[PDB]
Amino acid sequence: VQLVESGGGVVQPGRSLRLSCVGSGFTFRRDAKYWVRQAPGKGLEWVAAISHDGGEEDYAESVKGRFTISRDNSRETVYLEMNSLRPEDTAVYYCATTRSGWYFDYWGQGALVTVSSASTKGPSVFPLAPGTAALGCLVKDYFPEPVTVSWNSGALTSGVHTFPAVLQSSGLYSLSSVVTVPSSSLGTQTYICNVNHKPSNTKVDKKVEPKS
């Protein structure tokens, strides 16, 4: 009744990555399997399709023969061998089943695949000194996604806005997180932002003060 996907990660352009999608709670062999990807800030797009038995395989023109779809009914797993990966292939990939062969009845949780030649790099945290005062922190030049930002070790949960990351032309992501506080609260209250980037094992606690 549910689909579990695995094999996502970061792959350099021109390399190969193989995805897996294990089915359980239903007869895997009785229905066909499909792969649908979604680029960040973009709609869904069908990529690959395999029949109920693997007899016929069809792919979209965006992938052509670069991608290969296969299944193992014994393992209740459908694979998607991706070759000659391109930067436009960076998307979250879903696997779907369908009883009638027409509409994607069930979907998996999704596997994130990123195609980028940039290496892993820790973020740089810079302060943003200030009706009410505003302040924040700048998370810049880090790779890969994601990063987690918390204020005062989770004390500040109201008025905190963590903006989505933007991919710079250098290949390193960047985002800013801000929080709204009372105008005169900066005199006594101390505000510290906690930035955690697990892939680079970087944890930074930075204090922001107005006057320098």
Partner 1 sequence: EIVLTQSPATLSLSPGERATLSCRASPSAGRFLAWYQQRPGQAPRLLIYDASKRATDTPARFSGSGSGTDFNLTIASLEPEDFAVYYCQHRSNWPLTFGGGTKVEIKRTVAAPSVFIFPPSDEQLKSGTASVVCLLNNFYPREAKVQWKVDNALQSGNSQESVTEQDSKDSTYSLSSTLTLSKADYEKHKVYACEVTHQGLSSPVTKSFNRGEC
Partner 2 sequence: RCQSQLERANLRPCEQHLMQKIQRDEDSYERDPYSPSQDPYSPAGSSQHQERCCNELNEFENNQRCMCEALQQIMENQSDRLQGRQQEQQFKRELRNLPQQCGLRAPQRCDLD
- Judged by CB under 8 A, the chain residues 65 through 124 that form the site for partner 1 are 94, 100, 102-110, 124
Which among 1-9, 55-63, 104-112, 166-174 is the span making contact with partner 2, rule CB under 8 A?
55-63
CB burial of residue 122 (10 Å; 0-12, 13-18, 19+): middle
| Residue 90 interacts with, from partner 1, partner 2, none (CB under 5-8 Å by kind) | none
Residue number, 115 or 208, with CB nearest to partner 1:
208
| Residue 106 interacts with, from partner 2, partner 1, none (CB under 5-8 Å by kind) | partner 1
| Cβ at position 83, least distance to partner 2 in Å | 23
Residue number, 8 or 110, with CB nearest to partner 1:
110
Sign of the four-CA dihedral 62, 65, 66, 67: positive
CA angle at residue 107 from 22 to 58, to 5 degrees? 80
| Dist. CA 197–CA 154, nearest whole Å | 16
| Dist. CA 61–CA 65, nearest whole Å | 9
- Note whether 28 and 22 are within 8 A (CB): no
Two structure tokens written together for 189: 């209250």
| Residue 19 interacts with, from partner 2, partner 1, none (CB under 5-8 Å by kind) | none
Which among 20-28, 113-121, 129-137, 188-196 is the span making contact with partner 1, rule CB under 8 A?
129-137
72 is a site residue for partner 2 (CB under 8 A): no
- Note whether 3 and 19 are within 8 A (CB): no
Cis peptide bond N-terminal to 130, omega within 30: no
Which among 21-29, 38-46, 81-89, 144-152 is the span making contact with partner 1, rule CB under 8 A?
38-46
In one-letter notation, the amino acid at residue 24 is S
| Residue 205 interacts with, from partner 1, partner 2, none (CB under 5-8 Å by kind) | none
Residues that bind partner 2 (CB under 8 A): 29-32, 49, 51-53, 55-56, 58, 98-101
